[PDB]
Amino acid sequence: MERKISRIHLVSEPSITHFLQVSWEKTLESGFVITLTDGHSAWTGTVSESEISQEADDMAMEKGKYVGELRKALLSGAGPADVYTFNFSKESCYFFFEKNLKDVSFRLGSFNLEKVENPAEVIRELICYCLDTIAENQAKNEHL
Amino acid sequence: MEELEQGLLMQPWAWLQLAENSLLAKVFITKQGYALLVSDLQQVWHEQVDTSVVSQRAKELNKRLTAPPAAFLCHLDNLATFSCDCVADALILRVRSELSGLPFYWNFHCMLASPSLVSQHLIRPLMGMSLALQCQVRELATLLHMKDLEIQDYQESGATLIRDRLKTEPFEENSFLEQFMIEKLPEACSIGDGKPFVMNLQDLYMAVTTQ
Amino acid sequence: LDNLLRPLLATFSCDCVADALILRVRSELSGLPFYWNFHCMLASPSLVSQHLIRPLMGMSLALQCQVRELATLLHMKDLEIQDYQESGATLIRDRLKTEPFEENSFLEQFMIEKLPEACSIGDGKPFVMNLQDLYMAVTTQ
């Protein structure tokens, strides 16, 4: 399995650094679980095989190429040319994200999040994985 | 929109590579809308559209891919995959483009152009161009005759040629037509796919329409 | 009708009813007055393409090839007067010296000075006098 934490700003919230966590089985295309948090609260939802297909078909794009856009958007795979935009009501829990070009934003996709009932706990997990990941890349470095 | 029609009269023709054939298209774009005239050299088709139709038709063809009308129009001004159907005599021209790194769709709902615009956008210009081109032929033929009076003055007193390959025969217009009609007219008058028209006549097209 | 029209291409009148044109002939045959009406619909887009657009376009292309062939002709006469003055070691009566031809400037002078009248559609009059032998040739071709 793979996961990937990515740090973002919602358009709604200029000064709060949020964290996006994505988790899946090597193809993002197979569907994934997605968490957002701000260090106080957390939200989650899920996306599936046919939903990504559908989203790409509504946008008339080769799946895999659209998955490219998804990796770049959701897994920090953006180049300097790529500017992505992230939007969320906590109130509706509607996520959506976009790419900016032609001096305009362009929706790439949307999620139903649900506010998560055990906020501090998925946070605990998340940041333990981070402490581990920093320590691994540290022990690897010492060796190199 | 009156200014969209006025821009259109004076726009040149572009040439479009369909998979199925080619088209000729003149278009005038602003933030206000567009006007388009299209031809396959057998028929002619017209559309004019304001920003109201732009945001409606774009919201239909491109459900969630929002913009102001003028940003769509700006991209069409860049001008992709073209296909079409004549359904009745809607030449529906279907355009697939890339914008924002997203595939985009526009369909032009082009009705058979009115005989009045066919006159104003083709026949009268194309006639006016043939008359003007013939006056250019007439002025190159006076210029050729003038250069012969000049060169004959040399032939009349001394003045032999040095380079044995610079000779001109005396220009005579009837025989220059005679040779052209056999040797050059077959190729030169061929319509083909309209690429010859768009390649070499658009300056005269623009000038004659503005005259 | 043929012998009446051939010299002319009696009296005529022209009346439109909706889309249709009526052309009326008053003349005489066997001393007696003769009357005809031509009853014309709008020509179809096929006819207008075949009789007007396509040939007129084919004429403009062929005429553009004429202009091109006359410009290369003009430049070849300019190499020839140069070869007389520059090396053929001679002069003229001066009153006949032409300028060296350049088709850019030829077109710019033409299109400021001569285009306004040159492309005049007018009565269609000058098209039928200047251009028809080309029209018949382009249509055959």
Curated annotation (Swiss-Prot), chain A:
**Result of changing residue 61 to R:** Abolished interaction with NHEJ1/XLF
* Mutagenesis / variant outcome for changing residue 82 to E: In SSMED; impaired ability to repair DNA double-strand breaks
**Location of the region described as Interaction with IFFO1 in the Swiss-Prot/TrEMBL record:** 1-144
Annotated phenotype, changing residue 26 to E? Abolished interaction with NHEJ1/XLF
Q: What is the effect of changing residue 99 to E?
A: Abolished interaction with NHEJ1/XLF. Abolished ability to bridge DNA. Abolished ability to bridge DNA
Please list the tissues where expression of this protein has been recorded.
Answer: Widely expressed.
Effect upon mutating residue 58 to R: Abolished interaction with NHEJ1/XLF
Localization annotation:
Nucleus; Chromosome
Disorder this protein is connected to according to its UniProt record = Short stature, microcephaly, and endocrine dysfunction: A disease characterized by short stature and microcephaly apparent at birth, progressive postnatal growth failure, and endocrine dysfunction. In affected adults endocrine features include hypergonadotropic hypogonadism, multinodular goiter, and diabetes mellitus. Variable features observed in some patients are progressive ataxia, and lymphopenia or borderline leukopenia.
Annotated protein name in UniProt: DNA repair protein XRCC4
Native source species: Homo sapiens
Query: Its gene?
Result: XRCC4
Curated annotation (Swiss-Prot), chain B:
Q: What does this protein do?
A: DNA repair protein involved in DNA non-homologous end joining (NHEJ); it is required for double-strand break (DSB) repair and V(D)J recombination and is also involved in telomere maintenance. Plays a key role in NHEJ by promoting the ligation of various mismatched and non-cohesive ends. Together with PAXX, collaborates with DNA polymerase lambda (POLL) to promote joining of non-cohesive DNA ends. May act in concert with XRCC5-XRCC6 (Ku) to stimulate XRCC4-mediated joining of blunt ends and several types of mismatched ends that are non-complementary or partially complementary.
Q: What is the effect of changing residue 124 to A/N?
A: Does not affect ability to participate in V(D)J recombination
GO MF terms here are:
DNA end binding; DNA polymerase binding
What is the scientific name of the source organism?
Homo sapiens
Q: Report what the protein is called.
A: Non-homologous end-joining factor 1
A single GO CC term, please? Answer: nonhomologous end joining complex
Q: Which disease is it linked to?
A: Immunodeficiency 124, severe combined: A form of severe combined immunodeficiency (SCID), a genetically and clinically heterogeneous group of rare congenital disorders characterized by impairment of both humoral and cell-mediated immunity, leukopenia and low or absent antibody levels. Patients with SCID present in infancy with recurrent, persistent infections by opportunistic organisms. The common characteristic of all types of SCID is absence of T-cell-mediated cellular immunity due to a defect in T- cell development.
> Which GO BP terms sit in this record?
B cell differentiation; central nervous system development; double-strand break repair via nonhomologous end joining; immunoglobulin V(D)J recombination; positive regulation of ligase activity; response to ionizing radiation; T cell differentiation; telomere maintenance
Q: What is the effect of changing residue 13 to A?
A: Does not affect ability to participate in V(D)J recombination
* Outcome of swapping residue 106 to A: Abolished ability to participate in V(D)J recombination
- Protein family: Belongs to the XRCC4-XLF family. XLF subfamily.
Relate the outcome reported for changing residue 169 to A.
Does not affect ability to participate in V(D)J recombination
The UniProt record's further free-text remark is: Was named 'Cernunnos' after the enigmatic Celtic god of hunting, the underworld and fertility.
Indicate the impact reported for residue 64 to G.
Answer: Does not affect ability to participate in V(D)J recombination
| Shown part of the complete sequence | 1 to 224 of 299
Query: Which tissues is it found in, per the record?
Result: Ubiquitously expressed.
Q: How does it assemble?
A: Homodimer; mainly exists as a homodimer when not associated with XRCC4. Interacts with XRCC4; the interaction is direct and is mediated via a head-to-head interaction between N-terminal head regions. Component of the core long-range non-homologous end joining (NHEJ) complex (also named DNA-PK complex) composed of PRKDC, LIG4, XRCC4, XRCC6/Ku70, XRCC5/Ku86 and NHEJ1/XLF. Additional component of the NHEJ complex includes PAXX.
| Coiled-coil features, chain-numbered ranges | 115-157
Principal localization reads: nucleus
Consequence of changing residue 104 to D: Abolished ability to participate in V(D)J recombination
Positions of the record's site feature: Leu-lock: 102
